[PDB]
Amino acid sequence: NYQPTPEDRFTFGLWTVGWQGRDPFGDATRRALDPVESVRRLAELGAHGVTFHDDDLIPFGSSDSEREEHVKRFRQALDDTGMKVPMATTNLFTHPVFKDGGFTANDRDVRRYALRKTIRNIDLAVELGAETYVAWGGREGAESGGAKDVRDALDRMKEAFDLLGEYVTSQGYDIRFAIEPKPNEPRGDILLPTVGHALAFIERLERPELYGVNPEVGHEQMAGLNFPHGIAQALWAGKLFHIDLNGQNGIKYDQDLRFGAGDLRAAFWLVDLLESAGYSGPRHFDFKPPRTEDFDGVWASAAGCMRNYLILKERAAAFRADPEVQEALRASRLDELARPTAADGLQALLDDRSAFEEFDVDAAAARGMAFERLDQLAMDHLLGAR
Amino acid sequence: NYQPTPEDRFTFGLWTVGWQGRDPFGDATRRALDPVESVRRLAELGAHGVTFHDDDLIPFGSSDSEREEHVKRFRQALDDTGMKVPMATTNLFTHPVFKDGGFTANDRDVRRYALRKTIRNIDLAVELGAETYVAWGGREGAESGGAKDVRDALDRMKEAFDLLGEYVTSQGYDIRFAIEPKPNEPRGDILLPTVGHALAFIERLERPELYGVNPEVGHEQMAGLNFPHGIAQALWAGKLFHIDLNGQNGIKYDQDLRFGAGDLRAAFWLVDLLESAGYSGPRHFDFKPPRTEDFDGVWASAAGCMRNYLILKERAAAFRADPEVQEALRASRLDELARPTAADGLQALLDDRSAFEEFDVDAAAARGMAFERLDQLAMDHLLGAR
Amino acid sequence: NYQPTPEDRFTFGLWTVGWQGRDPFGDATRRALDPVESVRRLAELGAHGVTFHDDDLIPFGSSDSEREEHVKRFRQALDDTGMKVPMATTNLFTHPVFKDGGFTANDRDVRRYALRKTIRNIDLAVELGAETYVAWGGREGAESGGAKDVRDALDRMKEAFDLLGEYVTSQGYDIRFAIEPKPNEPRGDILLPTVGHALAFIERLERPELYGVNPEVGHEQMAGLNFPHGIAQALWAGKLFHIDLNGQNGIKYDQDLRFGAGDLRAAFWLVDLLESAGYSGPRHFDFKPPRTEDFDGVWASAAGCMRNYLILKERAAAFRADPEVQEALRASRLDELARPTAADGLQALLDDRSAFEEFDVDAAAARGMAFERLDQLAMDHLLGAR
Amino acid sequence: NYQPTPEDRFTFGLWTVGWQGRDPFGDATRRALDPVESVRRLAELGAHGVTFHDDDLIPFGSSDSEREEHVKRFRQALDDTGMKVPMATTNLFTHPVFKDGGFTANDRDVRRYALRKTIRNIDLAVELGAETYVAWGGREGAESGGAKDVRDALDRMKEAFDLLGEYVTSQGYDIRFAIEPKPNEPRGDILLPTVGHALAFIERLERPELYGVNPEVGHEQMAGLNFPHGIAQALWAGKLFHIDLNGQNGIKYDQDLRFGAGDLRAAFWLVDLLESAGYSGPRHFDFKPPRTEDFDGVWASAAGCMRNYLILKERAAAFRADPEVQEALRASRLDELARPTAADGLQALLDDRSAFEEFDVDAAAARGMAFERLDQLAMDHLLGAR
Ligand SMILES: [Mn+2]
Ligand SMILES: [Mn+2]
Ligand SMILES: [Mn+2]
Ligand SMILES: [Mn+2]
Ligand SMILES: [Mn+2]
Ligand SMILES: [Mn+2]
Ligand SMILES: [Mn+2]
Ligand SMILES: [Mn+2]
């Protein structure tokens, strides 16, 4: 019955089920949750673990005595439940000091502070066993053209990531970084707005092997992009270090719906790709239970994330294993797409009259791709109408 | 009076002013143009040169005798006018054989043909003096999830670009490649949909130094992205090999309006950045005169592209040179954004109590960025209201 | 097995399966179809009937002898198959004369011609038994601000529709009009861009009872709008005279995918609403088989439209009939939403201290809406995971 | 120098300059403002007046003694400055009780309360001299399909507006209502999402003459719609009771930038239309100074709204008065667009062989519209490049 177990590796941010429902036009609709109670509540649902921002575990401005007791209580809930902490991250967006950014703030002292805050939490992340450290530069960007020279800001962004990579190397940590793109909100435009921009930026770091992406379903969809396509490119690059799952109904504010909501067909093709590719990291949900809900609806929504992943996994596997689909894939030439165009090499291609001079372009053009039958088989599988 | 001269390097595709106005719901509204007459007509307007697809110079399926006479006539118009041909490209989208792509077609024979067609035109491009060879993979992509394994397709795309780079190296040509991203249309989703995705892909080629981007204003805006930001990232990467200028009114079909139309403020900030950065390549217009127009309106629209570039150039230069704006930039800390965050190095940063333990975050947060005054100075400059 | 029969009332435009695959960057990939063969082919698939533009039945500029033989051949295919023609429409977009519009062309003679062309086809539509006459003003609009005074254009649009309503009244026809909104493409902005704008405009006609809407799934989604919501408003207004079904993957060019493709969840909620409301008109598909397909894929895609409608109909009915869902609807107060707010009347409301002075807003606010559990039941039903 | 005076009728919501900068990912960056100080500060800038939500003048849950003193202090600032209060509105979105809506909440008691809260503030609005009472139903809508039957919700919405119209009639007030559309945010989809949907809904009210629209620039642009077009339709309907001015950079979260920011060309065409139409209501700014700013930047941003309106007013007037533009308008047939298509009547049109049988469609089609020259004259005027 699509019941999750910890071996499914489902994880959740403390800030997700813990979202109090404050939006830019409304006050909180739910009380804050003790992280201890979310660990317990999630473990009961079948989750594998939790993630946190530094401020989602230890309230900003804590004395070290308080910090110690916050951590201690959290550590006991993990031990009580068997939950893990595979990823953590820094809040560089909530406090007003970060109103123009953390790593790319125009104010140099803020940039320095953002790094000092980030490094403190990396140490804590390692202590709690995280393998991935995410950065979402939600305040990096601008509302107006003169406010941000983006060439200078990317210099400042490279600087920061290079320093964090020097730091983890100096400490001998095994943790790796994952940049989480978003195209806008809360800034008018955010730097590194998509998976492609983040991938490209990483290739300009001193130690590129230490940084990957953490793409979020709804964020690429906020640019009207195909999320499964961007995940394929991240996988092709060897850079899918982590993944954020949720739903989004098109180009609008970041909704962070429960996974499977939003674009259901894209959710199907995403799961198909993650499972085909053997992605083995956490299946992490970054989602807000809608503020219409009380705490029972919070946990229902969380359960739904996991349930929908496992239904889509079953339907995609059944699609890929159906001999009628395999035949259709053959009919649509997907096997040909995986064979080299010219393993025979450039000269042989140049000398191959069958590639140009005697190529029958009209017979090739007349050959239908048969993609609509293939896609209606995929639809039939998704809906259990086979 | 904002009169262009060839030294402004303005160029135009033959397919732009030559667009007959056929759209997906309407027939042609203008006759086809002889490329000779467009070269002459553009030179009279002050353009520096023209670009072409192979099929926009030599009709598909020409005998070599016909090909020779087409080229000869074009060459004479160039010589008659002093016009140049700085860029050329391949039509891998119009013919039905390319209905599932050229380089990433599922059919291997089509992929081979696409390369054979591309290489033939590279030789011609070199003969006519082009320094940049553009690729727009407008048919590379899918309408449905099962039709295109994107991992395999990027393998096929890398293959193709690697082969074209082996070819130009083997011939000793100096020409370089520029990939032109577009997120969708005519395919439901197009591969390498944005500047970031193209930049990232190039870093996976055998000879990355040979490939840059040719970003188009309207295409990044079709993903709701900030075009000046993406140009800054391309410039930061050292990869702005060429630029396509036009206008776009938001997220919708590719309009290819005359430059300055669409998002006027973004046009201002683009020109500001190109001129600040000392971009020295062609200012190339990829635009469709609307099909409401007759041939006089075609040439009016072309003239307008150039005029609007030169007005925005003047207003941006005046903005950057105004001592009141310089002071505002200082007030908004843009100078600080250009200074290293931590040239003193990681350890010094770690030991700097002013970066954390004794950082006054409340006083930093209280400091306004003054970006609205800066932006109203930019507005006043753009509108000539100073 | 979700097999359609004519009693399902599925209809298709001749221009849908007959689309030759010409897009704004590519030539045709399929030959044209004889309307006779599409009637036969669709009847074999289980369709109820077909619709046409005047130019999709009789080629533009036909002699009346030719027109007669075209009609005669079509009439025989209808009789041979039992197919019906419930709707027809005018092509006021393909010919270059309509480059600035038909009814709102700036040129008065074109406006007159557009009406003369429209009235000729209304007579033919009546002869073939249509009950609905659609208008899609795809060329009505502008690319630039000065080109179209929209106040004057709406005067010209009202004029035209008023004249067509006088005409059908004068002839004693029973046919009714349906305006099909689209927000853009082929014009930069199209007038009456959404269901709401069309509904509002109709209330300004001389005979409002004669005009409704024909909303198309993909067009409202091209404005990022909720198609089921707009259909509910059209139904609430008593104005859903006809409906166009297809799919659309977000805000981009009009894709006209096969129904069920695009936004699958929205397709579910649409079918739920049409069936709940007892909509009894044609279930009309306005769709393009992708130009990757040959004619077998054309018919596969058409079959898929019908299949997906019938699967979604079954799943929605099962949702609405499930006692667990009924209970959830009760828990989410949907029954309360259908009860008058204040049947007791204004004064009683004013005097009801329970409505303000003694209203417990905190207890009301604390009551969760339970919408996430309700929606996961809807998801479970859609996917057959109950 | 584009200095505003109260006769320009510029108004501002207390919540605009008073926005503390709390966004869905960040805390406040500015303290709250005393409404008294905003009235004074705005009057010094040249504003005509202010508007308020009930909760933006009197903190929620005030004793009547407190309410009295809040009002008294506000009244004295108005008298001290000569500022007016032309519009007011109800906060039916911030308090958690309104998490599923006010007038269309599923909970009947909340719907009753929303009306009781609305009516209390209408009385206060009248006392302070407002002529327009706005409703923005920002919580009316849904995130999921089953949560909201939209047919029932529109019944509940009609009910509420009908009751408020009975109330103001019963009291003999002269105030009129204006519905402010928004397509989404904070709900996933908001009911009456555009100007067209609101216009259409009003025609279903018992007393339609009492309700108009208050369209907001950024909200229609959040649906990718042309704001000047929707204003023209509202003006054509006689329903532009009020207007909200700001800027928006495309399809994304509601930015509420200072007017003239966002889409500058659309701002030009809007002002052109308001001034051409002789719109005489308040020019009301609904805008957020970005949270990067301190209070000096708040007032700079407010000043900028007014400045940009007055620059665009000058440039549009100069466009409309330029004899070269008048000639171009004549060349593009805008005069013809304003002449009836068929004042000669239906029969005369039917009998006019020049309208069909002898219409030269090819010569008509060959006539260019000359819209690009017209639009480059508009551009030259906007930029002061004539
Ligand atoms: Mn998100
Ligand atoms: Mn995330
Ligand atoms: Mn383009
Ligand atoms: Mn281009
Ligand atoms: Mn369509
Ligand atoms: Mn349609
Ligand atoms: Mn707004
Ligand atoms: Mn507003």
Two tokens at D303? 């000043």
Round to whole Å and give the CA distance between C294 and D277. Answer: 53
Number of other CB atoms surrounding residue C353 within 10 Å: 9
How many residues are there in chain D? 386
Cβ-contact A105, A92 below 8 angstroms: no
- What is the DSSP-derived secondary structure letter of residue C34? P
Two tokens at B152? 């395999």
Element (H, E) at C12: strand C10-13
Cβ-contact D118, D165 below 8 angstroms: no
Across the beta sheet with C84-89, the strand order is C211-213, C176-179, C132-135, C84-89, C49-53, C10-13, C283-285, C244-245
Q: Is B180 annotated as a binding residue?
A: yes
Q: Do A26 and D186 touch (CB under 8 A)?
A: yes
Q: Do D196 and C192 touch (CB under 8 A)?
A: yes
For every residue of B238-266, DSSP letters joined together read T-B---EE-B--SSSS---BPBTBS-HHH
Q: What are phi and psi of B78, to 5 degrees?
A: -65, -45
Q: Is A219 annotated as a binding residue?
A: yes
Instruction: Using CB atoms, pick whichever of D100, D232, D378 lies closest to residue C369.
Output: D100
Number of other CB atoms surrounding residue C275 within 10 Å: 15
Spatial neighbors of D44 by CB under 8 A, at least 6 apart, are none
Round to whole Å and give the CA distance between A106 and D73. Answer: 40
ω into B186 cis (within 30 of 0): yes
Two tokens at B291? 């099909």
Two tokens at D38? 């905003």
User: Among residues C67, C15, C20, which one has the least CA distance to residue C38?
Assistant: C15
Interface membership of A184 toward D (CB under 8 Å): yes
Indicate the burial class of D151 (C-beta count within 10 angstroms; 0-12, 13-18, 19 or more): middle
Interface membership of A185 toward D (CB under 8 Å): yes
Q: Which ligand is nearest to the CA of B13?
A: 4
Task: Show which subunits contact D, needing at least 3 CB pairs below 8 angstroms.
Answer: A, B, C
Round to whole Å and give the CA distance between B119 and C351. Answer: 84
- What are the CA-CA distances from residue A70 to residues A20, A42, A123, B300, D171 (Å)? 20, 19, 15, 69, 59
Cβ-contact B291, B21 below 8 angstroms: yes
- Give domain limits for chain B: 1-386
Instruction: Using CB atoms, pick whichever of A21, A143, A290 lies closest to residue D290.
Output: A143
Spatial neighbors of B94 by CB under 8 A, at least 6 apart, are B55, C25, C26, C27
Enter the resolution in angstroms: 1.6
The environment of the single-atom ion ligand 8, i.e. residues with CB closer than 5 A, is D 216, 244, 286
Spatial neighbors of C202 by CB under 8 A, at least 6 apart, are C179, C208, C211, C212, C213, C239
The Cα of A179 is separated from the nearest Cα of chain C by a number of Å equal to 26
Distance spanning both ends of chain A, measured CA to CA: 19
Cβ-contact C162, C125 below 8 angstroms: no
Q: Do B224 and A195 touch (CB under 8 A)?
A: no
For Cα atoms C313, C319, C320, give the angle at the middle one, nearest 5 degrees: 90
Q: Is A335 annotated as a binding residue?
A: no
Residues D270-302 as b/e (b if ≥16 CB within 10 A, e otherwise) read: bbbbbeeeebebbbbbbbbbbbbbbeebbbbbb
Residues of A in contact with B95 (CB under 8 A): 361, 365
- What is the DSSP-derived secondary structure letter of residue D32? P
Cβ-contact C196, D200 below 8 angstroms: yes
Round to whole Å and give the CA distance between B241 and B131. Answer: 10
Cβ-contact B188, B217 below 8 angstroms: no
Two tokens at A61? 């401005």
Angle of the B227-236 helix axis to the B195-202 helix axis, nearest 10: 20
**Residue C339: CA count within 13 A, CB half-sphere:** 13
Q: Do A196 and B191 touch (CB under 8 A)?
A: no
**Residue D359: CA count within 13 A, CB half-sphere:** 24
Q: Is A152 a catalytic residue?
A: no
Among B residues 20-39, those touching chain A with beta carbons less than 8 Å apart:
none
CATH of domain D1-386: 3.20.20.150
- What is the DSSP-derived secondary structure letter of residue C17? H
Round to whole Å and give the CA distance between B297 and B302. Answer: 8
Indicate the burial class of A302 (C-beta count within 10 angstroms; 0-12, 13-18, 19 or more): buried
Q: Is D56 a catalytic residue?
A: yes
Two tokens at D215? 């369209």
User: Among residues C144, C50, B60, which one has the least CA distance to residue D265?
Assistant: C144
User: Among residues B121, B128, B132, which one has the least CA distance to residue B60?
Assistant: B121
Round to whole Å and give the CA distance between A44 and A17. Answer: 14
Q: Which residue has the tokens 């809360």?
A: A186
- What are the CA-CA distances from residue C174 to residues B9, C123, C133, C203 (Å)? 63, 12, 11, 20
Instruction: Using CB atoms, pick whichever of B250, B372, B382 lies closest to residue D300.
Output: B372
Cβ-contact D223, C225 below 8 angstroms: yes
Cβ-contact B300, B17 below 8 angstroms: no
Q: Is the C-alpha dihedral spanning A269, A272, A276, A280 positive or negative?
A: positive
Round to whole Å and give the CA distance between A303 and A41. Answer: 10
Q: Is the C-alpha dihedral spanning A54, A55, A59, A63 positive or negative?
A: positive
Residue C312 alpha carbon to ligand 5 centre in Å = 21
Number of other CB atoms surrounding residue B323 within 10 Å: 7
Cβ-contact D112, C355 below 8 angstroms: yes
Cβ-contact D174, D202 below 8 angstroms: no
Q: What are phi and psi of A302, to 5 degrees?
A: -60, -45
User: Among residues A113, D198, D58, D53, which one has the least CA distance to residue B356?
Assistant: A113
Cβ-contact A84, A129 below 8 angstroms: yes
Q: Is the C-alpha dihedral spanning C371, C372, C373, C378 positive or negative?
A: positive
Q: State which approach was used to obtain the coordinates.
A: X-ray
Task: Show which subunits contact C, needing at least 3 CB pairs below 8 angstroms.
Answer: A, B, D
How many residues are there in chain A? 386
Residues C5-21 as b/e (b if ≥16 CB within 10 A, e otherwise) read: ebebbbbbbbbbbbbeb
Round to whole Å and give the CA distance between A257 and A245. Answer: 9
ω into A186 cis (within 30 of 0): yes
Radius of gyration, CA atoms only, chain D: 23
Two tokens at A146? 């003169």
Q: Which of A55, A56, A263, A272 is catalytic?
A: A56
Residues of B in contact with A377 (CB under 8 A): 146
Q: Which ligand is nearest to the CA of D242?
A: 8
Q: Is the C-alpha dihedral spanning B349, B352, B353, B359 positive or negative?
A: negative
Q: Do B340 and A106 touch (CB under 8 A)?
A: no
Interface membership of C247 toward A (CB under 8 Å): no
Spatial neighbors of C278 by CB under 8 A, at least 6 apart, are none
For every residue of D129-156, DSSP letters joined together read T-SEEEE--TT-EESSGGG--HHHHHHH
Query: Which residues face C244 on adjacent strands?
Result: C216, C284
Round to whole Å and give the CA distance between C209 and C177. Answer: 9
Instruction: Using CB atoms, pick whichever of C183, C200, C268 lies closest to residue D200.
Output: C200
Element (H, E) at B366: helix B361-366
The Cα of A200 is separated from the nearest Cα of chain D by a number of Å equal to 24
Give the rounded distance of the alpha carbon of B176 from its chain centre: 15
Across the beta sheet with D49-53, the strand order is D211-213, D176-179, D132-135, D84-89, D49-53, D10-13, D283-285, D244-245
In this structure, the dihedral spanned by the alpha carbons of residues A32, A246, A9 and A49, taken in order and rounded to 10 degrees, is: -10
The Cα of A353 is separated from the nearest Cα of chain D by a number of Å equal to 45
Round to whole Å and give the CA distance between A353 and A355. Answer: 5
The Cα of C199 is separated from the nearest Cα of chain D by a number of Å equal to 6
Round to whole Å and give the CA distance between A91 and A71. Answer: 17
Round to whole Å and give the CA distance between C95 and C108. Answer: 17
Among C residues 280-319, those touching chain B with beta carbons less than 8 Å apart:
290-292
Cβ-contact A180, A51 below 8 angstroms: no
Number of other CB atoms surrounding residue B79 within 10 Å: 9
Give the rounded distance of the alpha carbon of A373 from its chain centre: 31
ω into C228 cis (within 30 of 0): no
Cβ-contact C279, C243 below 8 angstroms: yes
The Cα of A264 is separated from the nearest Cα of chain C by a number of Å equal to 7
